[model samples]
Target: RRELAIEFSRVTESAALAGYKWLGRGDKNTADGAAVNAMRIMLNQVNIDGTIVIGEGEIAEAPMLYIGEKVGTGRGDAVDIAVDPIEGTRMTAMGQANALAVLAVGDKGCFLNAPDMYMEKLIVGPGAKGTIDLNLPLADNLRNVAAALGKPLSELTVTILAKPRHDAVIAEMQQLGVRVFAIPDGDVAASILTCMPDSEVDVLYGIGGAPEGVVSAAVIRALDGDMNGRLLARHDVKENRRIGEQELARCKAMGIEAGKVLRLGDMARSDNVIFSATGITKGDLLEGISRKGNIATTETLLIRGKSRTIRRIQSIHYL
Candidate 1:
């Protein structure tokens, strides 16, 4: 994983560059498809036997990087991979902040095989590890985290998705005197901020994609941070009976249960992991890709979990 850290960065950079080509085009699928193609192409060039455990889509749904697809050169370490070619396709399409191309690689079975569904998450940095529990009420977890960090509730900061489902949660946090930073998309970037030394984001709590939750777990666990997640079937969260039933059925097929609390270790079982994210639109984590004519600059956040080394690479690309 150490030797391949930079190699993964190159893969994400290629995906980000490909996604950049379709930025603000108002067509998210096109942008995402371009990124998926680029990531798949670059991944095949790396020296490893990589399996897409958590990836673009189910094998029958996506054409590339599907859940069971194989990548890499079929020559080196065997690893499981999770990827979101474009974490915020809508943000990239609208040129909004925090769009990213993200990937995570770990020892086989290191990543939880979570079905694509809504997941409620609670996360805190190293300072507040062991203070968060998804089973607890949100306010209690926040109080615990604040105490662990030795900060007053009024002084604590939290990040959450700016979605309708989070309206009550946001309002409750505000009334509790905690500072809130609500984002439109890109929870992976926001989640990473909890562990970033320079970032003011103290915690990330909300309901988002289970895949993103697993991705966040990889880096957060590598940083010695703590997180917990609970899977939610669509029908349990809302009223989409048909699709929700299908999603729940898929969960059973995977031999996983919804509504069970998943600790950090359960989601990301290994400390030896590699994670990468290249910013496609500027936001909290890294600078967005900037281009002039045929030249472009991309900023990538690369993390080696075992060493707990974090690198921010700014590369100049001649397109």
Candidate 2:
């Protein structure tokens, strides 16, 4: 599993580097294209037969990382794959921080094939495990997180997407005396940071893409952290309200209840599931890949839940 995860890291690191080269060029298509191509190449290298449970673009409408896409050599164990070939496309295009090339692998039938929509997510790291209740009121949940972390409410930092949809949630957090770190985008990076001991980000809350929630849930599962998310459909108009209703109904029909606690085992059915990610730009968990002479350096995290193992690998890629 470690070897597979390492290989996955290598692929994403390469994609991120390629995307970085296009920084400040002001061409989203080009930046996204490089990342998509790089990710596709890496997915093709996997030995197992895999289906994309969560991905960047939608089928028929998306070019790469489309949901339900088949990947790998189609020869080994059956597994599920979730990927954000480039997590912060705007950040990468603008040469900002916290961009990444991330992927999560789980056993078949484990991960939620979440529709591409916003989700109200709440997450805490290992220290505050079992402390958060998704059904709790927003302010109460913030207080609970502060108590679990043994910090004053003023000292606890909460991260949320800096969007108008979160205005109410942000107001509630402020009322509770919790400091907020409002980011422009990239909830995958935000949610992962809540689990990092050194990250200073105590809790992660607010609305983000549902697919990203599933990806973050996978990571929390591996780290023994906790995450709870409920779908937040687009409310642009009453007509769009039912967009996610059918999908949600289908999930329920499958006997897969909503709001069920997610675990690493729930994301992947295979005991051999592997997870890996590489930092494209400076972020909380890992540093961005940097190049010097003929070699490029990258920081990565690999996790194999079956063994309860997590490793940080810093390596130089010689081009």
Candidate 3:
């Protein structure tokens, strides 16, 4: 497992380096393709018997690194993988903040094979964990969080995606004088930022991809932060569930027809969790790649859920 974790670091690093070339190119697909391709090449080199439990979609739809694809070198312990090749593809193309190449791996059965759907999230860091409730409104959640962080309501900062859907929520935060820092995209990066102690972002709330919620859950769990997501029912299960058997099982597991709230543990299980993300572009949480002639530098953030150990690895790859 240790080797797998270390190898995964290289996987993310390779993806970031590959994607870095396409950053700010104003082409999201090319940027995403570069990242996914690099990640897949590196992932297959790992020694474990890994399965991409959660990813783009079914094998037939997503040609590379699709959900349920077997990875690694076909040896060692079996494991599950969750991947978001380009968490902020738009951000990477727009030259905005928080673009990351992310992946989470754990013992078999840890990752939630979430269907592509909207998930309402309440993302909070360590001390703020026990304070908020997803069922409660942001005003109430903020109060409990204020008590947790020992700060006044006015001093709190919340990061949310600036979309038409969040107009109502932002209006409520405004009347209460809670500081709002909105982003055009990159909810995964925003949620993960909420878990970092030094991040100006205090909490993240709103609806985002359920797959992103699972990826952020891994990061939050490693930081000892808290994240809760309730998969919002979009279409009737009888009509919307895509693919076949895996989709069927996912429907029964998450109750997609009925919808259900998922805590950090439910999303990314195992107590011993490993998460790695490399910035493809400069972001709030980590720096983008830096290239000086033949020497290119990358920053990779790695975390362990069990020990709460955090590492920011910066290495130079001579290209």
Candidate 4:
């Protein structure tokens, strides 16, 4: 996977560079379309046989990089790929912070084929693993996270998506007196921030895309953080339930239960896993794209889970 780490980071880098061209354009689809197109163009240059398990959408719906779509060269190592070309479309469109271009890949079938569903997520950095759960009360989970972080409840901060469905969760976080950092979208980047230094968010709570849950779990797994995602069991997720008995039996054969709380092991468990992200606009994790004359610079975070390594790459390009 070491061979693929830098290569994958470029995939996100190209996507970010493309999306940055439309910064604050107020047209999310055009910005996202640019990112996805650039990413798809770069991915084929890498040497791997990759299948996208979680992507833009079902093949019939999304034009490129869609779920079940194949990527990379048809001749290299087989990989299960998940790509989020522009994680926060509106963030880029509106010039808000925390937008990212992200992707994760593992050995074939190493990642979960999450049913494009909504999932209730609970996340914390390294110390909170095995201590919080979706089945527990929200206050109880917050208390558990605070204890794990070695901080007072009032001093800790939690990130929840600012959606009507999550209004209650955010209000509950406030009632507990913990700081609530709300964002209109881009929970994937928000979820990973809980584990990074200098990040305002200490925990992640509420519902987000199931595909995003799996991607965040991959990154969190690399950071040694704890994350749990439960399928929301609502109408929005019924299509995900369409994965039938055959796949269930297949996963059972693979030693996974195929149902229950989505665990890191179930989503991105692999001997060789890679995560790559490039900041679209300035944020805690990476710097926003900078251009001067014919040169463009980008900041990237690359992780090789099997090697237990973290790479901060600052690249300069002349075009």
Best by lDDT: 1
- Residue-level lDDT tens digits of model 3 in 159-204: 9888887898899997898999989888887888777778888899
Q: Candidate 1: lDDT over CA atoms?
A: 0.92
Residue 191 lDDT in candidate 4: 81
Give the range of the ten consecutive residues with the poorest summed lDDT in model 3: 235-244
Q: What number of clashing residue pairs does each candidate have, in the order they appear?
A: 0, 4, 1, 0
Decide which is better by lDDT, 3 or 4. 4
Question: Which ten contiguous residues of candidate 4 have the minimum total lDDT?
Answer: 232-241
Comparing 2 and 3 by TM-score, which wins?
A: 3
Q: Local error of candidate 1 at 73, Å?
A: 0.7
Poorly placed runs, candidate 4 (over 4 Å): 233-259
lDDT of all predictions, in order shown? 0.92, 0.77, 0.82, 0.83
Better of 2 and 4 by lDDT: 4
lDDT of 1 by residue, 55-115 (tens): 9888899999999899999999999999899999998989888889999999999999978
Q: TM-score for each prediction?
A: 0.98, 0.89, 0.92, 0.90
Cα lDDT of candidate 3 equals 0.82
Model 1 residue 242 CA deviation in Å: 1.6
After superposition, the stretches of candidate 2 with alpha carbons farther than 4 Å from their true spots are: 236-273
